[PDB]
Design a protein around this ligand. Structure first.
Ligand SMILES: O=C1C(=O)N(Cc2ccc3c(c2C(=O)O)OCCO3)c2ccc(Br)cc21
Ligand SMILES: O=C1C(=O)N(Cc2ccc3c(c2C(=O)O)OCCO3)c2ccc(Br)cc21
Ligand SMILES: O=C1C(=O)N(Cc2ccc3c(c2C(=O)O)OCCO3)c2ccc(Br)cc21
Ligand SMILES: O=C1C(=O)N(Cc2ccc3c(c2C(=O)O)OCCO3)c2ccc(Br)cc21
Lengths: 149, 149
């Protein structure tokens, strides 16, 4: 479980927000892209796996699951690509709740920046630092550190 | 020291590679940009600080140190912006050595991808996973986890 991530794609202002969630911690990374393509998804996964020890990725849909470019990136980066089918049905709802929360945070900061991408990164910051008392950022580090020992 | 990062800017193929180094671990994040502007640097720091607990950044030059946009981002993200003057003169050399090593890794992967940005992210991956035996990725997590506890 310390190496497990979930991809998630949501839409705002006619653009796409691509999100990777560390399942055990709730920590996220995100980017704005014009549209979800295999190439964009593959590049996003390469960035993620260079930054955190990504063992398994639950892909967000069948097109990315199928994409040869995504498969090439997962091979390159040593990532096991899996489906993201909510076998535990509470998964649909958890992701849905996350997307709603992210968009809410984006709305709270939206006026501080001109570009959506800036507002998205502010929202990533706010989410990962929020005290729930540990934050997601603290949890991911502790989880992986425990795993290393 | 767990919160201390150093910015570094290097050039390749007529483009700019912006690098943030976690001083205590040697862990890096990097991006390709057309040119090093305050706005690009500010955005890069926002991304970094949303992902890792950035307390202090040693800026790479006086223009970024002075930039109002960089100062605004450091304020927003709770980052103490400092100079990057090598008071310990081995700093010039360590950064120089890093840039040389990065470019070498980029050269080793360059043919596998068309875009420089992809090759840079492959090099980030290879650097952060390389066993020196701990890797930089392992060191940064351990350092921050120890700090949390
Ligand atoms: O509300 C949520 C949520 O459920 N998560 C996802 C999540 C998944 C699994 C978890 C989570 C979270 C989380 O609450 O961040 O927390 C404990 C560990 O298990 C979010 C992530 C980003 C943003 Br913005 C909002 C949320
Ligand atoms: O609020 C802004 C902002 O406007 N940007 C920078 C910026 C400066 C000038 C611009 C900008 C932006 C931007 O929103 O990226 O958009 C194009 C118009 O001119 C930020 C970067 C980091 C952080 Br934290 C906050 C912000
Ligand atoms: O050769 C180096 C180097 O010195 N570092 C920077 C660095 C700074 C301080 C350290 C470092 C490193 C490092 O070797 O990564 O290692 C142990 C902790 O103290 C590099 C970072 C990325 C890449 Br690519 C190459 C290098
Ligand atoms: O080697 C490539 C590659 O070509 N890309 C993706 C890619 C696919 C098709 C392209 C690409 C790229 C790319 O280099 O980003 O460049 C534009 C021409 O058509 C990679 C993405 C992740 C990883 Br890991 C490796 C690679």
């Amino acid at each position: 479980s310390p190496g497990i991530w979930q991809l998630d794609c949501t839409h705002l202002e006619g653009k796409v927000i691509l999100v990777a969630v560390h399942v055990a911690s709730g920590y996220i990374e995100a980017e704005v892209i014009p549209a979800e393509t295999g190439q964009e998804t593959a590049y996003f996964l390469l960035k993620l796996a260079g930054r955190w020890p990504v063992k398994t990725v639950h892909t967000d849909n069948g097109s990315n699951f199928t994409s040869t470019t995504v498969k090439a990136a997962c091979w390159w980066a040593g990532i096991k690509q899996e489906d993201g089918i909510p076998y535990n049905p509470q998964s649909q709802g958890v992701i849905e709740s996350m997307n709603k929360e992210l968009k809410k945070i984006i709305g709270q900061v939206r006026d501080q920046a001109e570009h959506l991408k800036t507002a998205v990164q502010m929202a990533v910051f706010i989410h990962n630092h929020k005290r729930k008392g540990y934050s997601a950022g603290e949890r991911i580090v502790d989880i992986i550190a425990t795993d290393i020992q």
